[PDB]
């Protein structure tokens, strides 16, 4: 069963196979007095691996690369960060030093610089406007519009029907809003609807934090976000 926040010591990383050629990676971090789990994705790219998001910091991301070599044994050659927060780009320098080509949109790279977070090296083109989708190796990158952040991207794995929502999609256990500091609360439901219209075939939906589920996570997120706005 999927590892939970209490099952991962901070500094360790676990992998969970979702489908053939698709894993999530799961780490934990102490943040503002509490312990949170955090997910990213690993997607087989021929005889290489594509990474979606760091494991939230240099230590965790070094542990991620070690666990990938131990459990999978294919080299990570590219990585995409899905927004500019530390749980997505924290560890990009570890990746860069290990020879991983790190990617993000121009908006994510800009916002990371403003915030003082690590900056992915490469810029992704074609994701500037809501509804834009681009193929990137074995995934499709999709910009649904502003939500958890203005730059947030989602990732679809067509061979496996896996939708990676990142932090724009909440796990079912979360029934109140979390980090809204950089969010566009008003647009977030409309952006989630764009995802639902674009990836109706998704079987697995992976949130940025916590347990995977189905497409139900999309409505769930909309429910919680709207309830926060109306506080
Ligand atoms: C440090 C990251 C940057 S996105 C963060 O703030 N994450 C919160 C969020 O994503 O809203 C959060 C995740 C899980 C929870 O249970 C509660 C809050
Ligand atoms: Zn975030
Ligand atoms: Zn997050
Ligand atoms: Zn719900």
3-state secondary structure string across 115-155: HCCCCCCEECCCCCCCCCEEEECCEEEECCCCCCCCCCCEE
228 a catalytic residue: no
Cα-based distances in Å from 191 to 35, 151, 164, 169, 231 = 28, 12, 14, 11, 21
Task: Indicate if the alpha-carbon torsion angle 119, 125, 130, 136 is positive or negative.
Answer: negative
| Dist. CA 96–CA 77, nearest whole Å | 10
Instruction: Tell the residue nearest (CA) to atom 14 of ligand 1.
Output: 209
- Resolution, expressed in angstroms to one decimal: 1.8
Residue spans of the domains in the chain: they are 1-231
Q: What is the DSSP letter of 171?
A: -
Q: Is 167 in the pocket of ligand 1 (CB under 6 A)?
A: yes
Three-class SS state of 207: strand
12 is in an annotated binding site: yes
Beta-sheet pairing, 14-19 with 122-123 = unpaired
Query: Residue 109: is it exposed, middle or buried by C-beta count within 10 angstroms (0-12/13-18/19+)?
Result: buried
Q: CA Rg, the chain, in Å?
A: 16
Residues with a beta carbon under 5 angstroms from ion ligand 3? 87, 167, 208
Topology of the domain covering 1-231: Metallo-beta-lactamase; Chain A (3.60.15)
Long-range contacts of 115-119 (CB under 8 A, 24+ apart): 115/84, 115/85, 117/84, 117/85, 117/86, 117/89, 117/90, 118/89, 118/90, 118/91, 118/92, 118/93, 119/89, 119/92
| Dist. CA 199–CA 163, nearest whole Å | 8
Q: What is the DSSP letter of 199?
A: -
Q: Which residues of 40-73 are buried (b: 16+ CB within 10 A; e: fewer)?
A: bbbbbbeeebbbbbbbbbbbbbbbbbebbeeeee
Instruction: Tell the residue nearest (CA) to atom 18 of ligand 1.
Output: 178
Q: How was this structure determined?
A: X-ray
**Strand residues in 2-114 grouped as ranges (E):** 14-19, 22-31, 34-45, 48-52, 76-80, 101-104
Ligand 2 midpoint to CA 110 (Å)? 15
């Amino acid at each position: 069963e999927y590892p939970t926040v209490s099952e991962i010591p901070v500094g360790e990383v676990r992998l969970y196979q979702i489908a053939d050629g698709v894993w999530s990676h799961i780490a934990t971090q102490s943040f503002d007095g509490a312990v949170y789990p955090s997910n990213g994705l690993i997607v087989r790219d021929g005889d290489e691996l594509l990474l979606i998001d760091t494991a939230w910091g240099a230590k965790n991301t070094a542990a991620l690369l070690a666990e990938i070599e131990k459990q999978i044994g294919l080299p990570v050659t590219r990585a995409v960060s899905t927004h500019f927060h530390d749980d997505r780009v924290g560890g990009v320098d570890v990746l860069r030093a290990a020879g991983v080509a790190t990617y993000a949109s121009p908006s994510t790279r800009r916002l990371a610089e403003v915030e003082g977070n690590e900056i992915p090296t490469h810029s992704l083109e074609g994701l500037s406007s809501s509804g834009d989708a681009v193929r990137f190796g074995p995934v499709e990158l999709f910009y649904p519009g502003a939500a958890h952040s203005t730059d947030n991207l989602v990732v679809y794995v067509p061979s496996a029907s896996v939708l990676y929502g990142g932090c724009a999609i909440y796990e079912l256990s979360r029934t109140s809003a979390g980090n809204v500091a950089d969010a566009d609360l008003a647009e977030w439901p409309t952006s989630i609807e764009r995802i639902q219209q674009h990836y109706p075939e998704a079987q697995f939906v992976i949130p940025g934090h916590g347990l995977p589920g189905g497409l139900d996570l999309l409505k769930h997120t909309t429910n919680v976000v709207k309830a926060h706005t109306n506080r």
